[PDB]
């Protein structure tokens, strides 16, 4: 009898960038969701396809925990049927998405006085991503007709841009840590059940 490691997901030290989000697989454990029922003032606890109250009574084949960091005004983009920079070029959710999304402010943790340049996002891309797709390419984007030849210049841009988090920023431009819990059901013994 093993409890699920939700603490190691919510209480981590370093969170991945949005364009290289981190995925963890949770299986063969008893899911105690009280750690989510207590919480603290939290920016978002929105669930899709299932009620938060019934979680302690459903068995899932496996659970996916996806962790990353964005800014405040983009938190609304982590939801099915959304469009924008993050939705189209960084992280996309399916239309028939079952799972929960939790998001909370992290200004005291991910902000630096001179600017934090460790968190980056993709700005230029020629097409959207299929759901649950990751792109870690770092090649020069050709905006014009003349090929770039791997060097920046006119009509040739490095794709990734830096957030530059500062403590003097507005609430919408402050860092937010986002965890997406995705639930799956297939022909499996459903080793993630809960206390029932």
């Amino acid at each position: 009898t093993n409890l699920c490691p939700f603490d190691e997901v919510f209480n981590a030290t370093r969170f991945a960038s949005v364009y290289a989000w981190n995925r963890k697989r949770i299986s063969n454990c008893v899911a105690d969701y009280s750690v989510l029922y207590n919480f603290a003032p939290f920016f978002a606890f929105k669930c899709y396809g299932v009620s938060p109250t019934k979680l302690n009574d459903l068995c899932f084949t496996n659970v996916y925990a996806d962790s990353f960091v964005i800014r405040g005004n983009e938190v609304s983009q982590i939801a099915p049927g959304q469009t924008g920079n993050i939705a189209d070029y960084n992280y996309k959710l399916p239309d028939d998405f079952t799972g929960c999304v939790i998001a909370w402010n992290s200004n005291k943790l991910d902000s630096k006085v001179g600017g934090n340049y460790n968190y980056r996002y993709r700005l230029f891309r020629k097409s959207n991503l299929k759901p649950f797709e990751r792109d870690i390419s770092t090649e020069i984007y050709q905006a014009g007709n003349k090929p770039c030849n791997g060097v920046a210049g006119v009509n040739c841009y490095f794709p990734l841009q830096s957030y530059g988090f500062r403590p003097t920023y507005g609430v919408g431009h402050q860092p937010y840590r986002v965890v997406v819990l995705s639930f799956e059901l297939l022909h499996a013994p459903a080793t993630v059940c809960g206390p029932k």
């Epitope: 005004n73 983009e74 469009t83 924008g84 920079n85 189209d88 070029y89 700005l123 230029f124 891309r125 020629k126 097409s127 959207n128 984007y141 050709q142 905006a143 014009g144 007709n145 009509n155 841009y157 841009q161 530059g164 500062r166 920023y169 507005g170 609430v171 919408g172 431009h173």
Partner: antibody, heavy 117, light 108 residues
Framework: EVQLVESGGGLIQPGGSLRLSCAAS????????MTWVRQAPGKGLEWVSV???????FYADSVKGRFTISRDNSKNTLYLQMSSLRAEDTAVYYC???????????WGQGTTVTVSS | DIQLTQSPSFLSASVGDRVTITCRAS??????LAWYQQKPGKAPNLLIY???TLQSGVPSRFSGSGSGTEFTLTISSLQPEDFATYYC?????????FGQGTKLEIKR
């Protein structure tokens, strides 16, 4: 040679329809952020619509449900389709290329649209 | 819905002066601001981006600084070709907002 040249504007009656065109030279319209902006006579600039290089489009609250943005790859052109024109839509229209935090660098020359009886 | 406001709506200055213009936000919009120049009857030009960086081709006499709520554009010395209108632009998520506009004239 990187430039944008616009056309397709003139006189029109209230409730009418119009289509403004902007042809590119050196910029691939299907790989850049493209924007339509407008400026009323002696009133300042106001954003109208934006199209991404993935198909996503966004409009302001003052043109929502009436204006549409189109992009033709074969002709390398950007179109603005306006329906239900009113007296508030008389202005000079600009097609621009948006770089994000790097700003809008390339501008056209503009086309005038006047709506009256 | 962040609204951008420019402090001096007009400014009469002579050739050889140092001028400053201020753009103030309503909520706080990080360090992403753009500064554009427009001469009568022509399209705008891009002067400043990222609230401090200078776009290629603009002379060194232009400068900018700010973060959060207040931003400032500065011209060190006024050449005869610098009399025009100036605008501040902010991107937000998917809502582009411009300012009222500040006009420059010739002192007399």
């Amino acid at each position: 040679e990187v430039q944008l040249v616009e056309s397709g504007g003139g006189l029109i009656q209230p409730g009418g329809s119009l289509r403004l065109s902007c042809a590119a030279s050196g910029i691939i319209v299907s790989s850049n952020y493209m924007t339509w902006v407008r400026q009323a006579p002696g009133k300042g600039l106001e954003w109208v619509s934006v199209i991404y290089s993935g198909g996503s489009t966004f409009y302001a609250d003052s043109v929502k449900g009436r204006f549409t943005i189109s992009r033709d790859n074969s002709k390398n052109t950007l179109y603005l389709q306006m329906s239900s024109l009113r007296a508030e839509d008389t202005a000079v229209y600009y097609c621009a290329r948006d770089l994000g935090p790097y700003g809008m660098d390339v501008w056209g020359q503009g086309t005038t649209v006047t709506v009256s009886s | 819905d962040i609204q951008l406001t420019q402090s001096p709506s007009f400014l009469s200055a002579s050739v050889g002066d140092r001028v400053t213009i201020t753009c103030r936000a309503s909520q706080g919009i990080s360090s992403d601001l753009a500064w554009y120049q427009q001469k009568p009857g022509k399209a705008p030009n891009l002067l400043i981006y990222a609230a401090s960086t200078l776009q290629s081709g603009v002379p060194s006499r232009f400068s900018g600084s700010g973060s959060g709520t207040e931003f400032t554009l500065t011209i060190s010395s006024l050449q005869p070709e610098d009399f025009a209108t100036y605008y501040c632009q902010q991107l937000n998520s998917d809502l582009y907002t411009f300012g009222q506009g500040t006009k420059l004239e010739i002192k007399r």
